[PDB]
Amino acid sequence: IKQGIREVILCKDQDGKIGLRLKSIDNGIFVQLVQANSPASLVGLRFGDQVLQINGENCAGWSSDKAHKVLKQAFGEKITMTIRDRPFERTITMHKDSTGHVGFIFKNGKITSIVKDSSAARNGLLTEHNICEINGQNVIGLKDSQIADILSTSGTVVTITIMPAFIFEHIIKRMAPSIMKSLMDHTIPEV
Numbered sequence: 042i043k044q045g046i047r048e049v050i051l052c053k054d055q056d057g058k059i060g061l062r063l064k065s066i067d068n069g070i071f072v073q074l075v076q077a078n079s080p081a082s083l084v085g086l087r088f089g090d091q092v093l094q095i096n097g098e099n100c101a102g103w104s105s106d107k108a109h110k111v112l113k114q115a116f117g118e119k120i121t122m123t124i125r126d127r128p129f130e131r132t133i134t135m136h137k138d139s140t141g142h143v144g145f146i147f148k149n150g151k152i153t154s155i156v157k158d159s160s161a162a163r164n165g166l167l168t169e170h171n172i173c174e175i176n177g178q179n180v181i182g183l184k185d186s187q188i189a190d191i192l193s194t195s196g197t198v199v200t201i202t203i204m205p206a207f208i209f210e211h212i213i214k215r216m217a218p219s220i221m222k223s224l225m226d227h228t229i230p231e232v
Protein backbone atom coordinates (compact mmCIF):
# COMPACT_ATOMS: atom_id res chain seq x y z
CA ILE A 42 0.00 0.00 0.00
CA LYS A 43 1.85 3.08 -1.31
CA GLN A 44 1.26 6.51 0.24
CA GLY A 45 0.05 9.27 -2.03
CA ILE A 46 -1.70 9.51 -5.37
CA ARG A 47 -0.33 8.35 -8.74
CA GLU A 48 -1.49 8.82 -12.32
CA VAL A 49 -2.10 6.16 -15.00
CA ILE A 50 -2.71 6.43 -18.73
CA LEU A 51 -5.26 3.92 -20.02
CA CYS A 52 -6.19 2.99 -23.58
CA LYS A 53 -9.27 1.06 -24.72
CA ASP A 54 -8.45 -2.25 -26.40
CA GLN A 55 -9.70 -3.18 -29.88
CA ASP A 56 -13.11 -3.95 -28.35
CA GLY A 57 -13.46 -0.58 -26.59
CA LYS A 58 -12.83 -2.32 -23.24
CA ILE A 59 -10.47 -1.47 -20.37
CA GLY A 60 -11.37 -4.35 -18.02
CA LEU A 61 -12.72 -2.38 -15.12
CA ARG A 62 -15.79 -2.28 -12.93
CA LEU A 63 -16.04 0.57 -10.41
CA LYS A 64 -18.10 0.78 -7.21
CA SER A 65 -19.33 3.87 -5.32
CA ILE A 66 -18.23 3.60 -1.68
CA ASP A 67 -18.67 6.42 0.87
CA ASN A 68 -18.93 9.06 -1.91
CA GLY A 69 -15.70 7.97 -3.57
CA ILE A 70 -15.16 5.51 -6.42
CA PHE A 71 -13.30 2.23 -5.96
CA VAL A 72 -12.08 -0.58 -8.21
CA GLN A 73 -14.42 -3.61 -7.84
CA LEU A 74 -12.98 -5.80 -10.62
CA VAL A 75 -9.85 -5.79 -12.76
CA GLN A 76 -10.20 -8.07 -15.79
CA ALA A 77 -7.28 -10.37 -16.61
CA ASN A 78 -5.34 -9.27 -19.73
CA SER A 79 -6.92 -5.84 -19.88
CA PRO A 80 -5.68 -2.24 -20.23
CA ALA A 81 -6.57 -1.85 -16.53
CA SER A 82 -4.37 -4.80 -15.48
CA LEU A 83 -1.52 -3.71 -17.79
CA VAL A 84 -1.38 -0.25 -16.23
CA GLY A 85 -1.47 -1.84 -12.79
CA LEU A 86 -4.94 -0.98 -11.49
CA ARG A 87 -5.84 -3.15 -8.52
CA PHE A 88 -8.84 -4.19 -6.49
CA GLY A 89 -9.57 -1.56 -3.86
CA ASP A 90 -7.88 1.38 -5.62
CA GLN A 91 -9.64 4.71 -5.27
CA VAL A 92 -10.15 6.63 -8.51
CA LEU A 93 -10.02 10.38 -7.81
CA GLN A 94 -10.23 11.63 -11.40
CA ILE A 95 -11.03 10.45 -14.89
CA ASN A 96 -9.64 12.79 -17.58
CA GLY A 97 -9.25 15.48 -14.90
CA GLU A 98 -12.91 15.35 -13.83
CA ASN A 99 -13.42 14.59 -10.11
CA CYS A 100 -15.22 11.38 -9.19
CA ALA A 101 -16.71 12.48 -5.87
CA GLY A 102 -20.34 11.43 -5.35
CA TRP A 103 -20.77 9.60 -8.69
CA SER A 104 -22.90 6.50 -9.14
CA SER A 105 -21.23 3.31 -10.25
CA ASP A 106 -23.48 3.79 -13.32
CA LYS A 107 -22.09 7.33 -13.74
CA ALA A 108 -18.45 6.23 -13.56
CA HIS A 109 -19.11 3.43 -16.11
CA LYS A 110 -20.98 5.91 -18.33
CA VAL A 111 -17.95 8.23 -18.32
CA LEU A 112 -15.44 5.51 -19.15
CA LYS A 113 -17.65 4.63 -22.12
CA GLN A 114 -18.30 8.21 -23.29
CA ALA A 115 -14.56 9.06 -23.22
CA PHE A 116 -12.43 8.89 -26.38
CA GLY A 117 -10.15 5.87 -26.50
CA GLU A 118 -6.94 7.77 -27.29
CA LYS A 119 -5.92 8.57 -23.72
CA ILE A 120 -7.80 8.11 -20.46
CA THR A 121 -5.92 9.59 -17.51
CA MET A 122 -6.95 8.43 -14.04
CA THR A 123 -5.91 9.76 -10.67
CA ILE A 124 -5.54 6.82 -8.32
CA ARG A 125 -4.99 6.48 -4.56
CA ASP A 126 -3.49 3.11 -3.66
CA ARG A 127 -5.77 0.55 -2.03
CA PRO A 128 -6.78 2.94 0.80
CA PHE A 129 -9.01 0.43 2.61
CA GLU A 130 -6.23 -2.11 2.73
CA ARG A 131 -3.19 -2.93 4.83
CA THR A 132 -0.25 -5.21 4.13
CA ILE A 133 1.29 -7.34 6.84
CA THR A 134 4.57 -9.21 6.48
CA MET A 135 4.94 -12.56 8.27
CA HIS A 136 7.62 -15.29 8.51
CA LYS A 137 6.82 -19.03 8.56
CA ASP A 138 8.17 -21.25 11.32
CA SER A 139 9.91 -24.58 10.58
CA THR A 140 6.53 -26.33 10.42
CA GLY A 141 5.64 -23.91 7.60
CA HIS A 142 2.96 -21.96 9.52
CA VAL A 143 2.44 -18.17 9.85
CA GLY A 144 -0.32 -18.86 12.33
CA PHE A 145 -3.92 -18.05 11.43
CA ILE A 146 -7.15 -19.71 10.38
CA PHE A 147 -9.45 -18.45 7.66
CA LYS A 148 -12.73 -19.41 6.03
CA ASN A 149 -13.92 -18.04 2.68
CA GLY A 150 -11.10 -15.52 2.49
CA LYS A 151 -11.92 -14.20 5.98
CA ILE A 152 -9.37 -14.52 8.79
CA THR A 153 -11.07 -15.92 11.96
CA SER A 154 -8.31 -16.93 14.39
CA ILE A 155 -4.79 -15.86 15.32
CA VAL A 156 -2.60 -18.59 16.80
CA LYS A 157 -0.55 -18.11 19.95
CA ASP A 158 3.21 -17.59 19.59
CA SER A 159 2.73 -17.23 15.81
CA SER A 160 4.16 -14.65 13.41
CA ALA A 161 0.59 -13.54 12.72
CA ALA A 162 0.29 -12.88 16.47
CA ARG A 163 3.65 -11.13 16.76
CA ASN A 164 2.69 -9.04 13.71
CA GLY A 165 -0.80 -8.11 14.98
CA LEU A 166 -2.88 -9.74 12.29
CA LEU A 167 -6.57 -9.18 12.76
CA THR A 168 -9.63 -11.33 12.28
CA GLU A 169 -12.76 -10.15 10.47
CA HIS A 170 -10.45 -9.12 7.63
CA ASN A 171 -10.76 -10.52 4.11
CA ILE A 172 -7.57 -11.56 2.30
CA CYS A 173 -7.26 -9.49 -0.93
CA GLU A 174 -3.71 -10.24 -1.98
CA ILE A 175 -0.92 -12.70 -1.19
CA ASN A 176 2.62 -11.70 -2.14
CA GLY A 177 1.39 -9.07 -4.57
CA GLN A 178 -1.12 -11.46 -6.20
CA ASN A 179 -4.86 -10.96 -6.01
CA VAL A 180 -6.55 -14.07 -4.56
CA ILE A 181 -10.12 -12.89 -4.33
CA GLY A 182 -12.56 -15.59 -5.46
CA LEU A 183 -10.03 -18.44 -5.18
CA LYS A 184 -11.09 -21.25 -2.88
CA ASP A 185 -9.55 -21.74 0.56
CA SER A 186 -7.56 -24.75 -0.64
CA GLN A 187 -6.03 -22.56 -3.35
CA ILE A 188 -5.03 -19.78 -0.93
CA ALA A 189 -3.65 -22.47 1.38
CA ASP A 190 -1.80 -23.76 -1.68
CA ILE A 191 -0.39 -20.27 -2.38
CA LEU A 192 0.71 -19.77 1.21
CA SER A 193 2.09 -23.31 1.39
CA THR A 194 3.93 -22.76 -1.92
CA SER A 195 5.34 -19.36 -0.87
CA GLY A 196 8.83 -18.93 0.51
CA THR A 197 9.50 -18.23 4.20
CA VAL A 198 8.35 -14.60 4.03
CA VAL A 199 4.63 -14.11 3.39
CA THR A 200 3.09 -10.76 2.59
CA ILE A 201 -0.66 -10.41 2.92
CA THR A 202 -2.95 -7.55 1.95
CA ILE A 203 -6.22 -7.45 3.90
CA MET A 204 -9.39 -5.39 3.98
CA PRO A 205 -11.92 -5.09 6.86
CA ALA A 206 -14.69 -7.54 6.03
CA PHE A 207 -17.43 -4.92 6.35
CA ILE A 208 -15.72 -2.82 3.67
CA PHE A 209 -14.84 -5.90 1.61
CA GLU A 210 -18.47 -7.13 1.64
CA HIS A 211 -19.69 -3.67 0.57
CA ILE A 212 -17.31 -3.57 -2.41
CA ILE A 213 -18.00 -7.04 -3.86
CA LYS A 214 -21.84 -6.84 -3.66
CA ARG A 215 -23.66 -6.82 -7.04
CA MET A 216 -21.06 -9.21 -8.47
CA ALA A 217 -21.70 -12.96 -8.64
CA PRO A 218 -18.81 -15.00 -7.08
CA SER A 219 -17.83 -16.76 -10.36
CA ILE A 220 -16.85 -13.52 -12.06
CA MET A 221 -14.50 -13.05 -9.07
CA LYS A 222 -13.15 -16.61 -9.39
CA SER A 223 -13.01 -16.66 -13.18
CA LEU A 224 -12.44 -13.05 -14.17
CA MET A 225 -10.71 -10.99 -11.46
CA ASP A 226 -7.03 -10.91 -12.42
CA HIS A 227 -5.05 -13.34 -10.26
CA THR A 228 -1.67 -13.07 -12.02
CA ILE A 229 1.69 -11.82 -10.81
CA PRO A 230 2.21 -8.45 -12.67
CA GLU A 231 4.23 -8.01 -15.90
CA VAL A 232 7.65 -6.29 -16.16
Ligand SMILES: O=C(Nc1ccccc1)C1CC1
Pocket residue numbers: 128129130131133165166167170203204205
Ligand atom coordinates in the same frame (compact mmCIF):
# COMPACT_ATOMS: atom_id res chain seq x y z
O1 LIG B 1 -5.34 -1.38 8.19
C1 LIG B 1 -6.42 -1.94 8.40
N1 LIG B 1 -6.54 -3.10 9.11
C2 LIG B 1 -5.47 -3.77 9.77
C3 LIG B 1 -4.66 -2.99 10.58
C4 LIG B 1 -3.60 -3.57 11.29
C5 LIG B 1 -3.34 -4.92 11.17
C6 LIG B 1 -4.13 -5.69 10.35
C7 LIG B 1 -5.19 -5.13 9.65
C8 LIG B 1 -7.73 -1.36 7.92
C9 LIG B 1 -7.84 0.13 7.80
C10 LIG B 1 -7.72 -0.69 6.57
